[PDB]
Structure formats: C-alpha cells, structure tokens
Ligand binder design. Sequence first.
Ligand SMILES: [Ca+2]
Ligand SMILES: [Ca+2]
Ligand SMILES: [Ca+2]
Ligand SMILES: [Ca+2]
Ligand SMILES: [Ca+2]
Ligand SMILES: [Ca+2]
Ligand SMILES: [Ca+2]
Ligand SMILES: [Ca+2]
Ligand SMILES: [Ca+2]
Ligand SMILES: [Ca+2]
Ligand SMILES: [Ca+2]
Ligand SMILES: [Ca+2]
Ligand SMILES: [Ca+2]
Ligand SMILES: [Ca+2]
Length: 92
Amino acid sequence: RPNHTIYINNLNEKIKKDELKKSLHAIFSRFGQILDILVSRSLKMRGQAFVIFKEVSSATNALRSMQGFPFYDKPMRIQYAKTDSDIIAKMK
RNA sequence: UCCAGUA
RNA sequence: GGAACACUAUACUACUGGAUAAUCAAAGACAAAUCUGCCCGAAGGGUUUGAGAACAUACCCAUUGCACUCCGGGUAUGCAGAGGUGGCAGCCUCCGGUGGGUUAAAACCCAACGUUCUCAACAAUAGUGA
Ligand SMILES: [Ca+2]
Ligand SMILES: [Ca+2]
Ligand SMILES: [Ca+2]
Ligand SMILES: [Ca+2]
Ligand SMILES: [Ca+2]
Ligand SMILES: [Ca+2]
Ligand SMILES: [Ca+2]
Ligand SMILES: [Ca+2]
Ligand SMILES: [Ca+2]
Ligand SMILES: [Ca+2]
Ligand SMILES: [Ca+2]
Ligand SMILES: [Ca+2]
Ligand SMILES: [Ca+2]
Ligand SMILES: [Ca+2]
C-alpha cells in the first residue's frame, strides 16, 4: 500500500554512493518534491536505495511510471516502503 | 658506491 | 628538506640527472600573513620513520538485500597537501590537479575538492644567535 518512500533495488552495485545519489534524484525529480534519499553500500543495504517524496501521489506516480527503468544497465525494481521513514514519522 | 643541482 | 626556538655546516632522506673530469638541463609547495568564535590543558609550535586500525580507489569472491547508528571477505594501491602555537567550526592565503567564466590564445577570476586516528620509535652532532 502507497507510502511517501519507495524502495528501489536491483541497482548496479559498482556505482559510487555520490554518483548514484545525484542520478537517482535526477530521474525522480519530475515526479515531485524529494525530501531525502537514503543510500548505503553495506552488505545488507547495497544495490538498493530509499527515495522519499513529500506527497504520496508523487511516490505512487513515480513507482508506476519508472518500474523496470534501465538504471545503469540494470532494470530498476521499485516497490513501496514496507515501513515509514524516520524523516516522516517524526513530523506527522 | 661515488658527483652536481634542488627540496 | 634536515625532524622539540631560529639559522648554517655535516651525516643523512627524497626528487632529477650524471661516472671521478662526474657536464648542460630538468626537478622545486612552509611565500605572505599570523584572523573569528567556542572549547579542553600543568605546558599548545614534529616538512622523521614504523606498526595497527579506519577510510578511499581498482579488480576478485560472496550478497536481490526494508534501511533510516558507521561497519562482508580478499589482493593491490595511498608515501601532497601546506601555513595561520591544542581541538571543533568558519574564514584568509598557498601548492596541486579537475570543472566552469573570460580571451584570438594566454594570463585573471569563480567554485568544489585533496588521507585521518591510535600506539611505538626517533627528534643526532658541530657551530652560531636571545
Ligand atoms: Ca620548500
Ligand atoms: Ca639548507
Ligand atoms: Ca632538531
Ligand atoms: Ca626557508
Ligand atoms: Ca614565512
Ligand atoms: Ca593556566
Ligand atoms: Ca607544522
Ligand atoms: Ca573493501
Ligand atoms: Ca590495505
Ligand atoms: Ca594523496
Ligand atoms: Ca587555483
Ligand atoms: Ca590565466
Ligand atoms: Ca565549503
Ligand atoms: Ca599521543
């Protein structure tokens, strides 16, 4: 079910944390306001990224019209955040 | 291993 | 450069180039100034080497992973960052290599950035100067 944050995995693991951040924000800006974007290259949190929007309609729209997107020769796998992000929890 | 210049 | 004021010589370290005649050339960052705030100490000043650890960058193995506190493993690499008396933050200047601006081209300018901590060793000798 719809949520401000979207979970993206199947991301090219060879990509630097800085480059990936700026690239993600770029392809997801046309969808709405981006409060933040979490990326880690840990053992557990790599190949993935959380991307938070300010509006749920933005996220819902981003998921739908970006699924399987060829992001670094690897078709994205977007999904809704199972849980809510801290940024949003401590707010409303 | 010596010699110069430089640092 | 030369390591706890400062300078010089020597041993010595590094860059670059040479063969007793040891060439020319190349190579070279501590130059200028000594800032602001806060904070810790009995005292603030390391152009040395090493060892751990962390971090970064190449590959290699493993990982398809729901986080929001950094944090898989392995091989190689790191030997350029500097000054402003400790630390954190900011600012000024320098050196370096990227990316912009301006030019006929430079030169000038703008911006972002550049390996850190811990332990251990070493910090000589000769001379000079408060
Ligand atoms: Ca010098
Ligand atoms: Ca000297
Ligand atoms: Ca000395
Ligand atoms: Ca000098
Ligand atoms: Ca000076
Ligand atoms: Ca005192
Ligand atoms: Ca110093
Ligand atoms: Ca690694
Ligand atoms: Ca290593
Ligand atoms: Ca370096
Ligand atoms: Ca410059
Ligand atoms: Ca110029
Ligand atoms: Ca800055
Ligand atoms: Ca100590």
